[PDB]
Design a protein around this ligand. Structure first.
Ligand SMILES: Nc1ncnc2c1ncn2[C@@H]1O[C@H](COP(=O)(O)OP(=O)(O)OP(O)(O)=S)[C@@H](O)[C@H]1O
Ligand SMILES: Nc1ncnc2c1ncn2[C@@H]1O[C@H](COP(=O)(O)OP(=O)(O)OP(O)(O)=S)[C@@H](O)[C@H]1O
Ligand SMILES: Nc1ncnc2c1ncn2[C@@H]1O[C@H](COP(=O)(O)OP(=O)(O)OP(O)(O)=S)[C@@H](O)[C@H]1O
Lengths: 525, 525, 525
């Protein structure tokens, strides 16, 4: 239809208003002293939440221009949340700071492209500087410490994460569900993890988590493009007779199949989920064979000649559980015999031995790693179900933070990492005045998180920020106790990966917003 | 859709207006001299009630922000009602007082978080002070007295509840039914009680009471989740042939099952209500076996291999009547033979003997307690049906108040307990000026119930409050007779539990509301 | 009446709008290719002028705040005009450029005071750079050249002014009148020069010239502060009998005295003007005695004991013509006998000889200089009266430009002096980022005059400015012939005192207006 076009400074001020609204709403909740934000619910009492993700998710604006500016900032912040699993409001605060200052400079007649270049130079220098500040978190002691800190200062969860990491390995797989007993337990069983997301969001049976949980499902294996609904009617009838949930592994699923599966799930007769095939090409076929070995299933490929119509329940694979993250999968305790798994591992090991290509050898090495290490499973232990769910959530987020710290490292949190790298990069200069201004904008915007935390605490942000800058090393402000001190000693730690991702994504969105003039949208109707 | 966002002081004033409206509407009906409140009935004459619960339930405003604030206060007040049984209007009055004073202080630039900390410290000291002031109510004489006072000064109900408590036990199960003869009767038979709530409010066949009553129903004992309606279609055919209502106890039911059961109940062909299974894991199965032994039913579990499709009426359990409270269940006189009942009791007794874990032994002990003590049945006795209903309601609310007093204790009522606690804590001080102001706000808000009661009586609230404060012990104001005196001599008594719950929940909602800035809601349309 | 107060950024934008309006209106007429501007005349046809002063004088805006901004810029531009004589539009263009860029920077969040400091540092460096670039104009050849260039390329007036200044002296005083014959005439006669302005503008009998012309007037000479009108009634009667205009030398006059003189001049019976006494103190008395010697008058002083009431026509002095200026005064051919003039000159010469104080000796030296050099009179010569007026105006403005060039020097005009200065000062840096920005604002605003001239010519200003910057020395753009070349060779020359004053005053107003927060006015009524 017709579309209103606003280009020039008016577009920029609309975008600025939108990012301002979203950033205020979401930054009010940053830190331990984050002030509550109450979101209206359609039916029943409103929810109260200091979680930045929820308040950001529930933000849409009336007028299209500032609404889409807010949507851009929200999308990049959610991307940052997906990258590291944390640091959403930090990313949005860094965004709001950089966009505000950069758009002020652009209104000041500066060249937007040079500002973009200066901000990019500043942020890459800050990223490598943070990598210089990073403290390794390889020892199990720091693993337990960060697990404790992430989960509201609980030592048991940190201990559990430490033991799981010791058992399954540094880069293994860790999952958590509920346990029957009051005591936490640990076990390791052959499993899986390949990075593929669900085809449609509607497969989520528990929206609050964002994944699915199929207790004892079948699993299908297919190297063939899902073309017609007629191909999987026999398996649908079989699974309906079985009264048991089902999963689908396919090369790709067509939109008509998307509509059919969504309709079937809404009907509730069959609980079917589908996910993209992992890997690619002959590697994809080999790992599909690995999954068939795991679950006792069989790969149905057109080249072989078999068809999805000729599929019996015996041909289908099985597992005792499966969870699909938004961009990852995990099957646990494949029914397939362990002797066959060992044989397949040995076969791929000789494939590694004969391998000459470096990247193919890396693919084979990670294939044997994921096929032999399996998955470590955690079961939470307490008395009542409310504490089951809350402690399960604590374990989940602590595991996310701990793995993020293991991947890259851990730096003194509380927003002092950014302060320290900013003070380090005080002498950075670009190729002209505009690039220098952009660099200074980035540097002064990287002080935003600490200032916001202090403002939420109620103290004067400028005084605390100046005091923190005066100190050196990890000297910083404690929001909880309102006392200065070595941030690492008091346990306030934030994974280097989360801060790096938040900073980089905020810089990316801010640079992309600074260099925008035209903005086409539907008419207000 | 688009969402209007209001953050800052305007959010606070909107929420203050909403709580003011709800608090006025519900506090006008506090105490014995509560003024009547009139509400719409869509068809017919309006209803008239001094009951705070109804007037609070029917309040929800037109503009979104104050509406949602009123919804917060209403939700917390209803939570207090569910926890204790009464004290809803007291909770809302305390919440209004604390909100008004706290927001007035926050407008004065005081730190919201410190105010919340001060209020929390004050209310914790207040709660332990109430526990200090608590008077035990273990004697049957005070049990009868509180039962009499709760039920509009009726001694017969106090006598009945005293006899029932003596017969079954202190922490037994008490139930009230309708009797044939004018004389009141009492009989105790093997029964059940586990704390689980209904899946959907639509199961409620009697909305005014909040539960359901099934005369001589079947009960379907299950162990797995409900995946398809096909699993219990033969059960539905059997219960339709029987023409007698049915209940479902199972691990869980899903959304399509809820829709199916709601549609079936609206049809009226089958009267079916489902409830979540009790316990957790192995003890869940143990108490399911206990239910099987009570009702003569059989546990259906996929692990055993049994399926819901092959369900026969003989396999179904039975009872002579069933009532499911909003968050509790009771089955009375399970048809199952009593012999197996004491066999199971003895078995679990030896399980207690061999038990080494303390909490598992506690679960086994409460299991044998609930399996041996059974349920008390107290059928009301009078001439006509109108007095049947009103006296049944009186027995219900008197039972709630009496058990609440038994659990914790009983303190001087009329709002004097809070006055005495506030006077005791007059010297409490926090860590700075803001926490001190918060503590003083809580303390001066503790005088709201007595002041409101006196204002409803039409006297001068400040004069009566000052006179009560001048006195010591339990010296207070008898609203009914408009004369001072020892509040316990004339029997005006409040359970410690209800006052404690009201105070704590008012403090909690006040802490959440004081520290709120952002408020997102749909546009006014 | 009440007063509307506007402080903050809205004040800056209001002032910016006002100065933008004034600057556009007045800058359209800059340079030789200045576009015509049409003003409005209350009665008759509109006037048409390319003169910047005329268009600026007639601009005041309906909105009060814009009007205050415009009036500030107009005041400082008129002050710049008064300092040198020509360069009003250049001053306004510089002021507009600096104001626009500086207020844009202030909106960019930079410190106004540091911006003002940077601009002041830049303009001081620019002023000393102009003094470096200055070329002496002592030779009569360049004097005739600049006289020709100022007077629309007329060589005769350049010749005349050269001869006159050779006759009198470098720092002499030059005057122009109308001659009976078509041939130009020149003569030197004993005269006077002291710097004092008219007490009220209403004394101006010729508003288009801003001065008074009294043919053969009497001159009063008084050292006493005017007190009452009765003191000069007898002299007023005497001069009314004489039927001749009068001029008054007095220590000072008050409100009622000047009001009565204004009333009398409006009546037209007596055409009397009054000017403040020159200098100060015993020097004032000594050169009042010099004036008495010049005109044959007498000093009337209370200390001597003589009063203004006792004043005969013989006591009054005489001259053959007198002209007042806004801040200057000259009397020509005092009737006083030349022998007395020589005697007084000798007396003050011996006073110089005995003088020991350096500054008193300087006053004595300039006193003898003005008492011996006298005045120059240049009678313009042509046929008709219209060319009489236009050539007299040409002589006046050429004389102003030539004396301005003689005082300080002459630099390559056409706006390239400032271009070269800005290019020279490209490496100047302040004490921080804000001062650096202010310096760059001043430097980029120095290019405004040439850009505006080129834009008036219709060419692309950026291209011509870049070409001129590329060249070095006095290479520049000729607006009239639209071809590049050497300014000195092409005769486009500007006094170094006309450009310095414009630049300094533009910088002064820009600094004074950048650091303006609050701005009160009267209500719009
Ligand atoms: N008590 C504390 N005092 C100071 N800084 C803290 C404290 N607790 C956490 N942080 C820091 O807060 C940053 C993360 O922001 P928070 O909102 O507090 O936590 P979060 O779980 O990351 O929430 P978001 O919305 O994802 S940023 C990290 O740099 C932590 O080191
Ligand atoms: N005769 C009395 N004199 C003084 N106070 C009384 C008297 N009778 C009851 N009260 C008090 O009045 C309050 C009763 O409040 P209600 O009007 O029943 O509402 P509520 O108990 O706060 O909550 P609900 O859900 O409405 S019962 C309690 O604090 C009693 O202690
Ligand atoms: N032929 C020319 N080529 C280029 N520039 C010229 C030429 N003739 C004059 N100029 C410049 O044009 C400007 C003359 O400006 P004007 O229009 O006279 O206003 P102004 O001199 O700034 O002030 P006033 O009071 O109006 S005279 C000076 O900067 C001259 O150096």
């Amino acid at each position: 239809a017709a579309k209103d076009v606003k280009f020039g400074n008016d577009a920029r001020v609309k975008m600025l208003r939108g990012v301002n609204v979203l950033a205020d709403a979401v930054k009010v909740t940053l830190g331990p002293k984050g002030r509550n934000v109450v979101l209206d619910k359609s039916f029943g009492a409103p929810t109260i939440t200091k979680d930045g993700v929820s308040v950001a998710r529930e933000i849409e604006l009336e007028d299209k221009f500032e609404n889409m500016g807010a949507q851009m900032v929200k999308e990049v912040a959610s991307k940052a949340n997906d990258a590291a699993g944390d640091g959403t409001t930090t990313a949005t605060v860094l965004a709001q700071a950089i966009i505000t200052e950069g758009l002020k400079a652009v209104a000041a007649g500066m060249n937007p492209m040079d500002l973009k270049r200066g901000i990019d130079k500043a942020v890459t220098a800050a990223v490598e500087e943070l990598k210089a500040l990073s403290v390794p978190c390889s020892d199990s002691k720091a693993i337990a410490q960060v697990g404790t800190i992430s989960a509201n200062s609980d030592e048991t969860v940190g201990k559990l994460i430490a033991e799981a990491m010791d058992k399954v390995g540094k880069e293994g797989v860790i999952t958590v569900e509920d346990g029957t007993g009051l005591q936490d337990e640990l076990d390791v069983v052959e499993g899986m993890q390949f990075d593929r997301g669900y085809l449609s969001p509607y497969f989520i049976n528990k929206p609050e988590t964002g994944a699915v949980e199929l207790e004892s499902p079948f699993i299908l294996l297919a190297d063939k493009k899902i073309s017609n609904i007629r191909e999987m009617l026999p398996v649908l009838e079989a699974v309906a007779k079985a009264g048991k949930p089902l999963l689908i592994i396919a090369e790709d699923v067509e939109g008509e199949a998307l509509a059919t599966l969504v309709v079937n799930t809404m009907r509730g007769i069959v609980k079917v989920a589908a996910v993209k095939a992992p890997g690619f090409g002959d590697r994809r076929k080999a790992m599909l064979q690995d999954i068939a070995t795991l679950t006792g299933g069989t790969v149905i490929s057109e080249e072989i000649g078999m068809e999805l119509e000729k599929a019996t329940l015996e041909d289908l694979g099985q597992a005792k559980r499966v969870v699909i993250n938004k961009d990852t999968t995990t099957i646990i305790d494949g029914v397939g015999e362990e002797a066959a798994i060992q044989g397949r591992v040995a076969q791929i090991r000789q494939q590694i031995e004969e391998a000459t290509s470096d990247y193919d050898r890396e693919k084979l090495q990670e294939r044997v790693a994921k096929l032999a290490g399996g998955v470590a499973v955690i079961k939470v232990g307490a008395a009542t179900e409310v504490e089951m769910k809350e402690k399960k959530a604590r374990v989940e987020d602590a595991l996310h933070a701990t793995r993020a710290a293991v991947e890259e490292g851990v730096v003194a949190g509380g927003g002092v990492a950014l302060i320290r790298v900013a003070s380090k990069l005080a002498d950075l200069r670009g190729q002209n005045e505009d690039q220098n201004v952009g660099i200074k904008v980035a540097l002064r915007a990287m002080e935003a998180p600490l200032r916001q935390i202090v403002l939420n605490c109620g103290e004067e942000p400028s005084v605390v920020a100046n005091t923190v800058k005066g100190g050196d090393g990890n000297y910083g402000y404690n929001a909880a106790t309102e006392e200065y001190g070595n941030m690492i000693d008091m346990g306030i730690l934030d994974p280097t990966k989360v801060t790096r991702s938040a900073l980089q994504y905020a810089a990316s969105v801010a640079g992309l917003m600074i260099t925008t003039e035209c903005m086409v949208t539907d008419l207000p109707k």
